[PDB]
Design a protein around this nucleic acid. Structure first.
Ligand SMILES: OC[C@H]1O[C@@](CO)(O[C@H]2O[C@H](CO)[C@@H](O)[C@H](O)[C@H]2O)[C@@H](O)[C@@H]1O
Ligand SMILES: [Mg+2]
Length: 580
DNA sequence: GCGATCAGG
DNA sequence: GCTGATCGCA
């Protein structure tokens, strides 16, 4: 059953054909400055395995890799491209990425390796990576014979699977989504990750010192009020102190014990002074452990930069995710946590951070897809959407909208943007499910077009089995037919929400591609560093700010043309914190 | 390893 | 509502 192939000791001309399935294996999960353990090539002439030290030192092979006219089919090309960038080698001509193809066909399958993608087309002549490399403290690279056969089988699977995957994408009207959006985006993300973001470690360390002192003060105060010392970080130990020793009311319980989440503590604060201190401790501890110590752990000592990895094939909405570190959830709401952003600085002297964000892109997308007259008019007038929503649902003039009314209208809009249930809204506003439902009812009366859309999209999901986005991304919802109210309800809200969130994801991805093309045409040194769902973060020479102030918003606003305009806000400064 | 927690959009 | 990082405890 063994698969034939040549275990080459040298690179030959037949290995450099203009079309091939290529495997440049990086076993380490985090591929930054990571080892390439082997290379496999499959083309019209045969199957070949090459030792990295050999292939990567060969001028012809390196030239072949960087030749845009020599087309390669791969799985997770970004991983290979980045690992190669760290070695000063350019990878060009990737015309098909099986990971991205599988992801577009069905994001819910969780395809994470060639074997998983192959199984989608009943191809099983390849082993899962985990079976070959193991996992955890057991994860390691097998002897050459085992490694070589695995890489060749993966290349062979890619070679065989390109056509059927492209055929199905074509049927789904997703061929352009792969070739014109996701694949070009993959290269841009590779550049962003490789560039990394500079961190002011001295500043971070100084902050940690301060928090350490503040944590010590609050920590001691907590034992003072509790009358004893315990592990505040232990929900179990803390639960004992709060609900047994101090006799605080049990307003909520968890699957295993007493609930001590912030929302619960907030309600208990009036009963005892220890509560506010626990909350403060929680806040400081979160910053210290996750955003100070955690960040410092992944900063590269030599360059002082962090190189995140964007997972482009994970979410069912089309959004990106960020890891090691996660740069999509750096604090900003509270001033104390916001200061963390002062640690993210430009990578060069006299450069600045530039940040541009879409203003309410999700609700604008909803106005467009639902063709709701009221919502479209609101955005055409560039109204404060929360104030407008409050005016409509509570039936009052703009002057009559109170701060509490706007806050609740804003919560309703938040619920619409993320597709939360009436139960979730009730929880967020600390009201009854019935009152939350009444708010939603009033909203649909004010925005009948949105109501019709939500009804129609649910019916469409049930009829076709999936829902789609502006650029044809797809999400299957098998649970839409469940006879279980909760399971079905969740699916219906995803049917409602995915076209909204997913289309917003499509738009910013296209904006990134359009922006990089524009930056190159204008020969600006400015470059993308991060994407945080509805915002783009760049760095550039201070002398390019004025040009970026006009260029970036324009490109982002013109990425697509909707029934309502798109609006982009922007700021720049010496640190990410200052780009506000 | 996994629940409980909390950060962002 | 989701994804990722932390912690404590299995
Ligand atoms: O290279 C990213 C790419 O690989 C997958 C597996 O095919 O994820 C792996 O690498 C990520 C970055 O280190 C990890 O977060 C993840 O746990 C690991 O399996 C894909 O999901 C991703 O698109
Ligand atoms: Mg915004």
């Amino acid at each position: 059953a063994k698969m034939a192939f040549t275990l080459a000791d040298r690179v030959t001309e037949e290995m450099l054909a203009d079309k091939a399935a290529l495997v440049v294996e990086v076993v380490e999960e985090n591929y930054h400055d990571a080892p390439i353990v082997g290379i496999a090539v499959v083309n019209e002439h045969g199957r070949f395995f090459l030792r990295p030290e050999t292939a990567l030192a060969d001028p012809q092979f390196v030239a072949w890799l960087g030749d845009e006219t020599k087309k390669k089919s791969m799985f997770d090309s970004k991983r290979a491209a980045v690992a190669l960038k760290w070695k000063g080698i350019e990878l060009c001509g990737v015309s098909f990425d099986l990971l991205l193809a599988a992801y577009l066909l069905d994001p819910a399958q969780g395809v994470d390796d060639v074997a998983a993608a192959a199984k989608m087309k009943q191809y099983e002549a390849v082993r899962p990576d985990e079976a070959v490399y193991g996992k955890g403290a057991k994860r390691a690279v097998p002897d050459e014979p085992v490694l070589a056969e695995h890489l060749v089988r993966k290349a062979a699977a890619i070679w065989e699977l390109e056509r059927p995957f492209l055929d199905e994408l074509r049927r789904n009207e997703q061929d352009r989504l792969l070739v014109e959006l996701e694949q070009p985006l993959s290269s841009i993300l590779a550049e962003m990750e490789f560039a990394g973001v500079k961190v002011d470690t001295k500043r971070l360390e100084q902050m940690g010192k301060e928090l350490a002192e503040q944590l010590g003060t609050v920590e001691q105060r907590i034992y003072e009020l509790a009358g004893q010392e315990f592990n505040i970080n232990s929900p179990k130990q803390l639960g004992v102190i709060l609900f047994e020793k101090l006799q605080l009311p049990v307003l909520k319980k968890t699957k295993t014990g007493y609930s001590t989440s912030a929302d619960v503590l907030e309600k208990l604060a009036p009963y005892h002074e220890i509560v506010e201190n626990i909350l403060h401790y929680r806040q400081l501890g979160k910053l210290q452990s996750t955003y100070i110590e955690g960040l410092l752990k992944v900063v590269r000592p030599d360059t002082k930069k962090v190189h995140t990895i964007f997972n482009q094939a994970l979410t069912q909405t089309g959004r990106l995710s960020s890891t090691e570190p996660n740069l999509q959830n750096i604090p900003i709401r509270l001033e104390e946590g916001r200061k963390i952003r002062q640690a993210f600085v430009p990578s060069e002297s006299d450069w600045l951070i530039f940040a541009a964000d879409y203003s309410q892109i999700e609700l604008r997308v909803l106005a467009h897809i639902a063709e709701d007259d009221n919502l479209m008019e609101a955005f055409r007038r560039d109204l404060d959407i929360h104030t407008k929503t409050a005016m409509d649902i509570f039936q009052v003039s703009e002057d009559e909208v109170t701060p509490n009314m706007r806050r609740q209208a804003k919560a309703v809009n938040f619920g619409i943007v993320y597709g939360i249930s009436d139960y979730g809204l009730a929880q967020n506003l600390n009201i009854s499910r019935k009152e939350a439902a009444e708010f939603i009812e009033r909203y649909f009366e004010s925005f009948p077009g949105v109501k019709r859309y939500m009804e129609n999209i649910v019916q469409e999901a049930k009829q076709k089995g999936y829902v789609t986005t502006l650029l044809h991304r797809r999400r299957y919802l098998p649970d839409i037919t469940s006879r279980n109210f909760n399971v079905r309800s969740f699916a219906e809200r995803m049917a409602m929400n995915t076209p909204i969130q997913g289309s917003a994801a499509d738009i910013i991805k296209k904006a990134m591609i359009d922006l990089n093309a524009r930056l190159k045409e204008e020969r600006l040194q400015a470059h993308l560093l991060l994407q945080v769902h509805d915002e783009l973060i760049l760095e550039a020479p201070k002398e390019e700010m004025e040009r970026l102030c006009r260029l970036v918003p324009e490109v982002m606003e013109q990425a697509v043309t909707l029934r309502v305009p798109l609006k982009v806000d922007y700021h720049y400064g010496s640190t990410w914190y200052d780009a506000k």
